């Protein structure tokens, strides 16, 4: 072997120019798409809010058009999924992880138009889904499409142009390039065998998209939280604890997301119409709540800022928590096209802030500011449910910019992943693949 | 297929023993990383108190500078040449081998050698970082526990080896994230699957960072304040700055290698022409660290000043060349210590320069050299050592200017891209290929 290694060392980091140049066109496309989508979604959430003014008087008529508009879209979505691309439902992450493993197909000619216009309806209706799902997937297929249209051959090409389309996609989501790369190489990638994924190709893709996203969403952070205070050394142990808690709760949230995934399968039992109709239902429920207590509906981005700031009361936090835990499952588990990635950040923020308030009054001699805990937690749920801590911590960083809380954010996140292991939890998208992969056999 | 389904359901399950051990490693790695950084400091101090003692008679002082630096430099080169020939130079290439199972981890040797070794080379003012000493001392640390507790299994030997490396790279630049990104983009077996438990690495890194924070709190290694921002029409400029680091990245590789040979002749393997050729360069550095410090020492001290635009165009170039020189000499000379840090300083300085030029060229971009200085700082590390992602994040973790993330990346990528299309190679991989080929021949 030693002589082989010496052969390889001297040949390390040499990616075929074709691969590199293609990772570039991918990232570019992924970006433009990620943009048009984020723009459509926004456009609808707008139209939707312009109809409520039209009928701003008659409260019940308004509460009505809220539900209806959200229902009508949500359905149009669920439909487009159930009817032309059953894969394109739910996350999309678990699916793309499969294709990297060569266990699932990448029917881009389908998913693209489906997941796209699909989530356009689910997100654009105010459902509790992030953009990750829609993009990450749309991203990868993007890369696939180029693979095929240019007929690029070889494992590297199929595995690389698939991985960049994923990262580009996760980047154009949270305008977080590093995270997009850390994601692939800590999660996306074939977790048990060596792979021909050229990191340097990923980068180029990520870059290109981040650049296209910067071309249209400049001067407006998704989450602005300002520079928080600092965290003294004698304050650290508290973020450990906050971690442990996210640790025992991480798996638990996993059971519910999975279990509810089933309990909701009965309601329509595989029937295109009980689905489409059960979707428009949850959908409308959200377009409603997004007017009578928005902090429980929609993406979730909007309340992180408010939460971190200590603007909510203990009561209002808890409520938002539970109400969100509910709306979350309902929309994801229901197999609606969209990520559970973003909404998980929100749950974290809120849960953290709460732990904070308590912390504060408990120890006035620490001079705490709930907002730090809110940030240690923001990505901790992602660390105990989706089990990709390092992608989380860096996903938080890239968006909150409080690198002075690097120690807490880590200790919380680790503490989460450690207890989400010693309580038997599992990588939520791995487990979603194991099911999808095992359900693909069991019926034979 | 059925196998994967078995594995998925079994992903991310690290044996509690492994985890608990990564923890003790990190802790140790830390405390060590601390006592080393403290020794080095202590000596650089003593050295400076002797120059006051003989502060008058200029030549007597220029003398005691050289001598104190020589005397330690030798004491070092000796401890390496005499009891642990592996512990000379970086240490990185070595540890990368052990992960590949192609080299031994003679901790019972390296530990006391590299440790007190660099204590002399660093503590004398040589152009070497702390990475080398620690990264290595780090992994050996993890080896030592492996053995003392008899932990068995690939995972255990590969994991407790990788954490000791990360914990080590962390406590170096108080940069946890980097420490972990390093392992998983560089250190690790580049061509086959491995049993390295990321979650184990973390715990270690943490523990050390926490130990480092217990003693170096409230004092950044590099304070640069919040720099300006970078407009979108200014980006292409950092692409160019990258290309440049791209063609110069390989070239600096040749010199580091080549000078590694041209310095082998001078002593030809002789313990005494080495020890004496080391205290020679060593004394040279303790001298320059008084008649133009910006060419000697770790290099950390001048990044701040550089980024700030406090140096003139002339003074920059000079510090560059002068440093390119002192760098090679100390590393290539196989003295114990990293070329990791001094490569940052070269980056800063090269960037700042590209900046000043940029500024005057385009007053309508309202540039501030300091930004290019930061896009470069780790661009060398991206074109020489070919670990961009570890670099970018290594810079980040220490400059804190996340608003320059786009530049830093485009520079760094542009570096690694041209250091590829101009034939260069991962400097610590090529150093292993040499050390590994000089073994089976």
């Amino acid at each position: 072997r030693r002589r082989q290694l010496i052969r390889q060392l001297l040949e390390r980091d040499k990616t075929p120019l074709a691969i590199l140049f293609m990772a570039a066109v991918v990232g570019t496309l992924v970006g433009l798409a990620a943009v048009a989508f984020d723009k459509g979604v926004a456009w609808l959430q707008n139209q939707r809010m312009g109809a409520l003014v039209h009928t701003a008087d008659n409260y019940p008529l308004l509460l009505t058009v809220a539900f209806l508009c959200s229902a009508v879209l949500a359905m149009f979505g669920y439909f487009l999924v159930r009817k032309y691309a059953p894969e394109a439902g739910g996350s999309g992450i678990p699916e793309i992880e499969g294709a990297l493993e060569d266990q699932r197909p990448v029917r881009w000619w389908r998913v693209l138009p489906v997941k796209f216009f699909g989530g356009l309806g689910t997100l654009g209706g105010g459902m509790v889904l992030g953009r990750e799902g829609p993009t990450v997937q749309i991203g990868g297929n993007i890369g696939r499409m180029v693979l095929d249209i240019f007929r690029l051959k070889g494992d590297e090409a199929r595995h690389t142009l698939l991985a960049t389309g994923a990262a580009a996609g996760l980047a154009a989501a949270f305008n977080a390039p590093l995270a997009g790369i850390l994601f692939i190489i800590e999660e996306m990638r074939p977790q048990f065998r060596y792979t021909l994924i050229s990191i340097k190709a990923v980068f180029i893709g990520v870059i290109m998209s981040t650049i296209m996203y910067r071309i249209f969403n400049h001067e407006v952070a998704l989450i602005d939280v300002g520079k928080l205070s600092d965290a003294p050394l004698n304050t650290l142990w508290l973020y450990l604890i906050l971690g442990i808690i996210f640790g025992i709760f991480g798996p638990i949230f996993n059971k519910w997301v999975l279990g509810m995934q089933d309990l909701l399968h009965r309601v329509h039992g595989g029937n295109i119409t009980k689905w489409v109709l059960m979707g428009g239902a949850i959908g409308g429920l959200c377009g409603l709540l997004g007017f009578v207590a928005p902090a429980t509906s929609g993406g979730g981005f909007n309340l992180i800022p408010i939460a971190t700031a200590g603007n909510f009361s203990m009561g209002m936090l808890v409520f938002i928590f539970v109400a969100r835990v509910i709306t979350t499952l309902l929309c994801f588990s229901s197999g609606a096209p969209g990520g559970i990635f973003a909404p998980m950040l929100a749950l974290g923020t809120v849960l953290g802030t709460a732990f904070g308030m308590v912390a504060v009054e408990l120890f006035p001699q620490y001079h705490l500011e709930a907002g730090t805990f809110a940030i240690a937690g923001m990505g901790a749920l992602l660390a105990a449910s989706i089990r990709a801590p390092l992608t989380g911590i860096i996903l938080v960083l890239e968006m909150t910019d409080n690198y002075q809380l690097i120690l807490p954010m880590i200790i919380t996140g680790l503490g989460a992943t450690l207890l989400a292991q010693f309580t038997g939890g599992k990588p939520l998208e791995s487990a979603i693949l194991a099911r999808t992969l095992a359900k693909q056999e069991a019926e034979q | 297929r059925r196998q994967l389904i078995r594995q998925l359901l079994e992903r991310d399950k690290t044996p509690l023993a492994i985890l608990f051990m990564a923890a003790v490693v990190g802790t140790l790695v830390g405390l060590a990383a601390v006592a080393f950084d403290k020794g080095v400091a202590w000596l650089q101090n003593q050295r400076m108190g002797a120059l006051v003692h003989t502060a008058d008679n200029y030549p007597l002082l220029l003398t005691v500078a050289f001598l104190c630096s020589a005397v330690l430099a030798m004491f070092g080169y000796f401890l390496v040449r005499k009891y642990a020939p592996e512990a000379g130079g970086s240490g990185i290439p070595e540890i990368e081998g052990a992960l590949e199972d192609q080299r031994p981890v003679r901790w019972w040797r390296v530990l006391p050698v590299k440790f007190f070794g660099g204590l002399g080379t660093l503590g004398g003012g040589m152009v070497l970082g702390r990475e080398g000493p620690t990264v290595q001392i780090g992994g050996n640390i993890g080896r030592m526990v492996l053995d003392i507790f008899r932990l068995k299994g690939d995972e255990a030997r590969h994991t407790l080896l990788a954490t000791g490396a990360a914990a080590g790279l962390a406590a170096a630049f108080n940069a946890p994230l980097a420490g972990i990104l390093f392992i998983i983009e560089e250190m690790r077996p580049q061509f086959r699957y491995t049993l390295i438990s990321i979650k184990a690495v973390f715990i270690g890194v943490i523990m050390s960072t926490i130990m480092y924070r217990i003693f170096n709190h409230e004092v950044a290694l590099i304070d640069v304040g919040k720099l300006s921002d970078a407009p979108l029409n200014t980006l292409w400029l950092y692409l160019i700055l990258g290309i440049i680091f791209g063609i110069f990245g390989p070239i600096f590789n040749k010199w580091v290698l080549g000078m590694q040979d041209l310095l082998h002749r001078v002593h030809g393997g002789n313990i005494t022409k080495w020890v004496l050729m080391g205290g020679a360069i060593g004394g040279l550095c303790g001298l320059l660290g008084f008649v133009a410090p910006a060419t000697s020492g770790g290099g950390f001290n001048l990044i701040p000043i550089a980024t700030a635009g406090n140096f003139s165009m002339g003074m920059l170039v000079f510090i560059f060349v002068a440093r390119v020189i002192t760098t090679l000499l100390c590393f290539s000379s196989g003295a114990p210590g990293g070329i990791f840090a001094p490569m940052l300083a070269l980056g800063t300085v090269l960037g700042t320069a590209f900046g000043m030029v940029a500024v005057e060229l385009f007053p309508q971009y309202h540039l501030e050299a300091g930004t290019f200085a930061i896009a470069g700082m780790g661009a060398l590390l991206a074109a020489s050592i070919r670990a961009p992602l570890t670099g970018i994040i290594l810079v980040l973790e220490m400059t804190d200017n996340y608003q320059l993330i786009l530049p830093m990346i485009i520079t760094g990528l542009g570096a690694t891209l041209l250091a590829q299309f101009t034939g260069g190679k991962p400097l610590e991989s090529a150093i292993l290929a040499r050390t590994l080929a000089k073994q089976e021949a």
Partner: antibody, heavy 120, light 107 residues
Framework: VRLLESGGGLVQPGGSLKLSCAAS????????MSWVRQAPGKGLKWIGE????????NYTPSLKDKFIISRDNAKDTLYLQISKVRSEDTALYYC??????????????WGAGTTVTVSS | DIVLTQSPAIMSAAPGDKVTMTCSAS?????IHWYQQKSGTSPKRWIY???KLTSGVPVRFSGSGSGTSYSLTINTMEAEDAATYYC?????????FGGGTKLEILR
């Protein structure tokens, strides 16, 4: 770094006075400011503290509104209102910027302080 | 709230002498601070976190202690060492101060 507190002086029993502290030589925000007082010939006693955004304001165990610590980061000034002043309030009042090492806070920099005399 | 009691309330020691003052706590404290106050001037952070010297504090000054007993020490107390030293804790809220120890130049 300078802390100049003023406002002190003669106040009639039962009256109220507003002490001021002009800060300069550092970013007034980011810092927790605090008041401490020293009664003639006696020890130091903490009055209270106020965080940067005034979201937290704690006082030594004392009467409900006896003290009112406020701050105006726009003027880099700290304020301490005392009410129902009685002889016990006669003392030198010091404003101090707060900080810490490991985390157990201390009174970083003190000012020269203003003397308050409660008498008729 | 924690009661810090400084042992010698008043003490005299000739220059160049090991001087040691105690700071006992009613309950348990950790990382207490020490302030030096010269007649006519504001207290000055001298020692913090139980033993760290504030920038500018001569090395003859040292402090140590734990749980319920701490002490500030001067290995060879100089003239400009005459002052009142106040210990302070904040390991518990609200922070409290010692009665202080007046260090006077015996002659």
């Amino acid at each position: 770094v300078r802390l100049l507190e003023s406002g002190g002086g003669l106040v009639q029993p039962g009256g109220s006075l507003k002490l001021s502290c002009a800060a300069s030589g550092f970013d007034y925000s980011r810092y927790w400011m605090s008041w401490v007082r020293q009664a003639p010939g006696k020890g130091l006693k903490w009055i209270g503290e106020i965080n940067p955004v005034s979201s937290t304001i704690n006082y030594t165990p004392s009467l409900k509104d006896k003290f009112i610590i406020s701050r105006d980061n726009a003027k880099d000034t700290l304020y301490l209102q005392i009410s129902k002043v009685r002889s016990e309030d006669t003392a030198l009042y010091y404003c101090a910027r707060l900080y810490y090492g490991y985390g157990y806070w201390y009174f970083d920099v003190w000012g020269a302080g203003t003397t308050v005399t409660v008498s008729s | 709230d924690i009661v810090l009691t400084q042992s010698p309330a008043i003490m005299s020691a000739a220059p160049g002498d090991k001087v040691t003052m105690t700071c006992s706590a009613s309950s348990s404290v950790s990382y207490i601070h020490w302030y030096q106050q010269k007649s006519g001037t504001s207290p000055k952070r001298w020692i913090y976190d139980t033993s760290k010297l504030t920038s500018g504090v001569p090395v003859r000054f040292s402090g140590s202690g734990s749980g319920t007993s701490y002490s500030l020490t001067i290995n060879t107390m100089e003239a400009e060492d005459a002052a009142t030293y106040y210990c302070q804790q904040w390991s518990s809220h609200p922070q409290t101060f010692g009665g202080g120890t007046k260090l006077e130049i015996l002659r």
